[PDB]
Design a protein around this ligand. Structure first.
Ligand SMILES: OC[C@H]1O[C@H](O[C@H]2[C@H](O)[C@@H](O)[C@@H](O[C@H]3[C@H](O)[C@@H](O)[C@@H](O)O[C@@H]3CO)O[C@@H]2CO)[C@H](O)[C@@H](O)[C@@H]1O
Ligand SMILES: OC[C@H]1O[C@@](CO)(O[C@H]2O[C@H](CO)[C@@H](O)[C@H](O)[C@H]2O)[C@@H](O)[C@@H]1O
Ligand SMILES: OC[C@H]1O[C@@](CO)(O[C@H]2O[C@H](CO)[C@@H](O)[C@H](O)[C@H]2O)[C@@H](O)[C@@H]1O
Ligand SMILES: OC[C@H]1O[C@@](CO)(O[C@H]2O[C@H](CO)[C@@H](O)[C@H](O)[C@H]2O)[C@@H](O)[C@@H]1O
Length: 628
């Protein structure tokens, strides 16, 4: 294998002898050269572990690092300052100061100029982090809500221009908000140029996808693949018009990119550098678990997938140190956590906590959630969870069967229950969700619907507002970067048109993707409305989280409440949180509370609470007790 110095001297060969002296003296080159020395050995080792003795490895690497230099050279000074700051503060992601939000630009604000106009509201709410849903050109009609990308460089004209996006990102930065966008790197749309050229037999785009002459290999792969959108097509493959078959994990119009080809890595690394220099702070690594395939396996969570992401990481350490990764791994908890690491994805979605929040509302029993906060919450140094309550996607019940079994719970039977409960097919349920991707091979299903819909707000259940408050309280206080699904903070209900819209009718996820509700947002300062109560509740919890150092960092220790309806945990040995998941009053006894100070201030309700006696929580009450 080559070395950092060799590669750098060749990178510099593009310059005249005179220019070259100016380059090597420059501050940009000095930073690049030391980051090369520090981080290139990781890049080389990760790529070697995947591609081995591949003839194209060295040429690809040289091409990539030449592009990395050009990119860093071009990178504007303000981003270069953020590079230095995050280079010396790996734990910026772990600060209690951070609170995130996510929205569709079109649905929430019409277009990018409109989004820029909403930035004062984001500041009002207290966001420091904003994820904008996929922005770029995609097929008209059905594009999986923009996740079928037809060009990585062209903004969807309905949203505006690439210049508009650069301005939004600058404006977010001026408002103290990090910009977060999707890195859609497992697949492109079938109308993407790479996809067209590859299928047409253009040598330049040879092996950019997985294309087969017939069903022989697809059938063999499909023996072990687990379907993602079972309504859409069987297995993992779709047929071309000419009779061939292409790997399509998701929709038929989404074709998996072939990372066994090192030129595909270079292509997407190139795209990563492009987004970096737009000033993107965090890249959402979409569908991370699918980027390596192997016959005889489920083709998810494979070792090469992890190595490839660690390779991407090193590219950012070299040419855009500010750019962090957020893992989207919705899979078994044992596998979810393997993506999270300083040298891989520094943060990742926490689907286990999310799914168990909803589980606990249904059962009123904190057993699985306590188990999860006890054994699966704490992370390696310099990493964090992203804690959420809802997202643009369905809810999957991705708790571990092994975990549940230890508690005498059958995972299969339990999911059968949860899936009936949350779509209002269980006696007494407050939930008004909609099924998604029922699967006749597994009996599996997921749940669509907004947070407000799932807690009972549609029928104005008197407990609805408190349920929302409780759920968000836990994401805001367990440790990690909390992510608000924008619209939830005023109690936004399910979309009313999705089911009869022919572009949407086969995808119930659109139920929980409503437009900005003008009426609700106008009520947000009136505490007599559900919108105002939710908003003031959440805003208060956000303010406390961000101001109070007891919430800092990602670590927690659970507290045994000895009440199966009440969750308990302690942050920084100074903040005792209780959450009552029962619709009835529930008590933590004086005996349980013996080690606590006699009195403690509750940050939620503002009162001084006695802990030297029974503590009785009202229905769905949350307490944040300052015990040190
Ligand atoms: O809030 C209503 C109800 O929810 C909880 O009970 C549910 C269980 O959590 C759930 O697992 C499921 O129980 C079934 C088992 O999974 C299955 O193995 C077999 O033993 O039959 C059970 C019933 O079908 O469904 C129940 C609810 O029916 C919670 O524990 C209850 O206290 C609560 O009243
Ligand atoms: O300056 C380094 C050294 O590189 C040699 C080639 O062996 O020339 C290379 O570097 C030059 C300056 O960057 C380039 O103009 C040239 O294309 C490249 O081959 C020597 O010419 C030079 O002394
Ligand atoms: O309201 C049901 C609505 O959901 C859509 C597609 O998302 O189908 C979902 O619900 C069905 C059960 O009603 C499931 O069989 C299906 O797998 C699930 O995606 C529509 O098919 C349906 O009209
Ligand atoms: O601490 C005294 C008394 O409290 C009991 C309740 O089971 O334990 C509780 O006290 C500890 C104080 O931090 C907690 O760590 C524990 O989780 C909590 O349940 C008994 O363990 C003990 O006798």
């Amino acid at each position: 294998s080559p070395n950092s110095q060799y590669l750098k001297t060749r990178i510099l060969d593009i310059y005249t002898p005179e220019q070259r002296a100016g380059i090597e003296k420059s501050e940009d080159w000095r930073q690049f050269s030391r980051r090369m020395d520090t981080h290139f050995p990781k890049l080389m080792n990760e790529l070697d572990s995947v591609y081995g003795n591949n003839e194209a490895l060295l040429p690809m690497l040289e091409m990539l690092l030449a592009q990395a230099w050009q990119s860093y050279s071009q990178r504007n000074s303000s981003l270069k300052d953020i590079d230095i700051a995050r280079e010396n503060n790996p734990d910026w992601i772990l600060s209690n100061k951070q609170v995130g939000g996510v929205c569709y630009v079109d649905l929430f604000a019409g277009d990018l100029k409109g989004l820029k106009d909403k930035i004062p509201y984001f500041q009002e709410l207290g966001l420091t982090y904003l994820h904008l849903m996929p922005l770029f050109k995609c097929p008209e009609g059905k594009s999986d809500g923009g996740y079928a990308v037809s060009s990585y460089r062209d903004v969807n004209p309905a949203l505006g221009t690439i210049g508009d996006l650069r301005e939004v990102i600058a404006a977010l930065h001026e408002a103290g908000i990090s910009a977060v966008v999707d890195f859609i790197f497992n697949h492109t749309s079938n109308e993407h140029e790479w996809a067209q050229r590859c299928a047409a037999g253009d040598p330049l785009f040879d092996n950019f996808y997985y294309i087969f002459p017939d069903r022989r290999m697809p059938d063999q792969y499909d023996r072990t693949l687990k379907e993602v959108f079972p309504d859409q097509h069987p297995g993992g493959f779709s047929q071309l018009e000419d009779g061939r078959w292409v790997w399509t994990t998701f929709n038929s119009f989404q074709w998996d990119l072939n990372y066994s080809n090192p030129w595909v890595f270079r292509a997407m690394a190139g795209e990563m550098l492009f987004l970096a220099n737009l000033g993107v702070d965090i890249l959402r690594m979409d569908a991370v678990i699918y980027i390596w395939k192997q016959m005889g396996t489920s083709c998810i969570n494979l070792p090469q997938a992890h190595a490839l992401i660690r390779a991407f990481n090193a590219v950012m350490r070299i040419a855009a140190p500010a750019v962090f990764f957020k893992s989207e791994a919705i899979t078994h908890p044992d596998q979810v956590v393997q993506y999270i690491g300083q040298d891989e994805c520094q943060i990742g979605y926490n689907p286990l906590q999310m799914a168990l929040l909803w589980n606990t509302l249904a059962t009123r029993e904190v057993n699985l959630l306590h188990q999860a906060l006890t054994y699966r919450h704490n992370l390696p140094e310099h990493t964090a969870w992203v804690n959420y309550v809802r997202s643009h996607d369905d809810i999957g019940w991705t708790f571990a069967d092994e975990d549940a079994a230890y508690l005498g719970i059958s995972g299969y039977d339990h999911r059968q229950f949860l899936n009936r409960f949350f779509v209002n097919r269980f006696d007494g349920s407050f939930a008004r969700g909609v099924p998604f991707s029922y699967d006749p091979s597994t009996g599996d299903a997921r749940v669509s619907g907004t947070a407000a819909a799932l807690v009972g707000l549609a029928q104005d259940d008197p407990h609805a507002v408190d349920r929302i408050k409780l759920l968000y309280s836990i994401a805001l206080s367990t440790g990690g970067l909390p992510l608000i699904y924008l619209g939830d903070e005023v109690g936004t209900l399910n979309d009313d048109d999705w089911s009869q819209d022919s572009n949407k009718s086969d995808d119930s996820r659109w139920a929980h993707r409503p437009r900005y509700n003008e009426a609700l947002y106008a009520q947000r300062n009136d505490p007599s409305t559900a919108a105002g109560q939710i908003y003031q509740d959440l805003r208060h919890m956000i303010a406390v989280r961000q101001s109070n150092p007891r919430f800092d960092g990602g670590r927690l220790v659970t507290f045994n409440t000895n009440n199966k309806h009440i969750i308990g945990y302690i942050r920084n040995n100074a903040l005792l949180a209780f959450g009552n998941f029962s619709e009835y009053p529930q008590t933590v006894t004086a005996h349980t509370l013996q080690a606590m100070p006699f009195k403690a201030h509750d940050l939620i309700g503002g009162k001084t609470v006695s802990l030297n006696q029974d503590l009785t929580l009202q229905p769905y009450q949350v307490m944040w007790l300052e015990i040190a």
